[PDB]
Amino acid sequence: STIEEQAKTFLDKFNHEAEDLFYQSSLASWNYNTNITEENVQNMNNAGDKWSAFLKEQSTLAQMYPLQEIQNLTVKLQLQALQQNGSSVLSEDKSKRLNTILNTMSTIYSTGKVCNPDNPQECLLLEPGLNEIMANSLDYNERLWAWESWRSEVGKQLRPLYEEYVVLKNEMARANHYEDYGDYWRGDYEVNGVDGYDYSRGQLIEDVEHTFEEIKPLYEHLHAYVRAKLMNAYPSYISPIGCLPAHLLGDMWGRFWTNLYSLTVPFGQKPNIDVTDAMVDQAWDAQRIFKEAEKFFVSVGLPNMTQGFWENSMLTDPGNVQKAVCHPTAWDLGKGDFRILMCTKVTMDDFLTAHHEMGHIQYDMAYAAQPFLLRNGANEGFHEAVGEIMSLSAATPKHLKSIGLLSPDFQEDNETEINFLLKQALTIVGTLPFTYMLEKWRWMVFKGEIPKDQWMKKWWEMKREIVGVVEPVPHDETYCDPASLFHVSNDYSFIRYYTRTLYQFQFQEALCQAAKHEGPLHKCDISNSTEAGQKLFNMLRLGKSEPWTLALENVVGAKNMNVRPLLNYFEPLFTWLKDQNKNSFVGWSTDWSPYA
């Protein structure tokens, strides 16, 4: 006769019913990725409609339970995730515009085109055609033509489509009694019902902005240092008084600046940390690569992989007729079934991705004892930051010499570590200003205090100030270049990448102090310490059953967002970065100098 005993009955019914339907959807999604077939497209639409209609039925039944009298916190978090209406609020004539638009985005993005206008000879796809022209060529004129090959031939037909998307997704919040759609994405971080642990939704905007005033002085010196070794290659092609072009920052999206290390190497006379030649003398293959990775984890203390994965999953690219895509993704099929879907290669990137995709798997069986609704990470930033702490340890020279990839006589001086640390700075420090600015623009435009004619003049004016990029060509309002990215078009919350960095270094300093390492955090190691392995797995196994704010108190003891344990990682780098920029002009104002 209690609501507490009534909720445990309903979640016990849902857990067995959902895991049957979730296994059918996960098994169906797995055969689609592994094998591309005609009937398999029809097979996906058959399983996906009855799976989507099942969540429609469970949401209506939990609505009649009032939420004002459930003092238990374990079932309150389950009911908050289950009661998200989503698409049920929309009408039938408006919900059919959901499945139509999202499938059109995937097909439009899959069209590869580099055929020249008024000269239609031939053009190939993205992977053999586009990546070679951005990573190898050094010509300004054709890359400028390639810049106008996608933002004026593809983005021109999105201007009536994307504006229709942002006027109806914003309307669900008033029908769901929220403020805006930006506040809806902050509901994942919202915690209620706990005394002293409550996190307001509006305090997160202030706290994120408050932590950005110490990110900025670090990013000022990074752009100043990288500008002296690039004007050497282009004496009269770039002027050394202004900023840098946007289409010269390493990747297609400019997220990672890893590809400028080969072009802008400081001292290339001594060899770089490259062991691709080391494995081919001893004839290393795919099996011996993953065998030493598994025994690395069991040496830490984590449980080893099950027997239903090695003889069941696929590892390499099989056959010749199977042209199925093998984009690196982590699979959680449930019921103890865990798979890795990627094409192995003997390269630098695939070896690091091999360590990276296993960490999400190692997080998944930890909360296997939890119920299905709580079988997830503590938030969207935990499942990504957990998968990256072993990536920091595996890239250390000590771990590489532990397996035997590096030479037994490899000295570790200053410059052998500055080359490694600056590689980590480009992939960690460089992604912090880009994540905050893009997510800040999307939150206010969903809130609505931005008119139609001030979108572009404010978006560009923060790129010149924060990032420091002068526009190579003026653009009018008919362009829609911010909507071309994959995450913004496909409804993905980008804030999980900002909190990934601030979490992966809170855990690193806490775990290294437990191991009593004498030295800096870059040289710290986790292996050969059984005391740290049993300590970590107890906190890994909790999952979403506990609030995420209690997870912070379980490792560092500070309830707030600390910024002090990030400069201590870069003290060897910061003092070196401070001496080269003694005379350079650090800190840009507003600059209309080149294109006045």
Added chain:
Amino acid sequence: ASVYAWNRKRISNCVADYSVLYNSASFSTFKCYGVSPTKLNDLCFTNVYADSFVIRGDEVRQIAPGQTGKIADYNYKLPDDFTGCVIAWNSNNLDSKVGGNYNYLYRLFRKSNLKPFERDISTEIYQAGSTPCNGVEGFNCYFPLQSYGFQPTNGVGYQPYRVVVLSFELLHAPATVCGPKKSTNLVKNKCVNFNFNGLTGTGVLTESNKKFLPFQQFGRDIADTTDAVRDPQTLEILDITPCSFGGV
């Protein structure tokens, strides 16, 4: 059968070979409660009722006397001081199929606690709230009958092991049937101890010229002194005489 439909049949009037389980080299859940596996071969109790059901891997420990849980409460409860043994082994090679083993069901909810060793077979629905269900699923029906899904790709925790439970309890019914006992080849013309079925003694063994009808087991001649036994392992009649002794 299903876990909620465990059978109960009496095993009697036959020999129970428990030694074949020891050398099977296939069981990984060989535990005995209240009795030793070695000492239950020669001696046994009546009421040899056997219960057969399938238990998932993550809930093997739930099925034990003095232990509670989910299956142990509303499906099958073992009473305290259960003098029996549990043996389980994996059945992935035969008791599994792709897409889910849609053959085993169970009861998940019930209003009241179950009495030990009773089986209920009904289609009654759960009634958590005061509002009754009129046959249509709502907010308080929660049909407890659910079909488990077993697949060859499931984890070790979800691997369904084949488990059989043998019960041994002592009641007023006498003359129970137990397992076999070792036999040793007969030795002749030597003072050797013998212990046949029900009788024992010490003496020398020799061939007998006498003949027995095929329904006697042994015999005596004078003053209740046994002088002839017929072992059924050989169908041969012998003489027993006390070996040489006297005063020096």
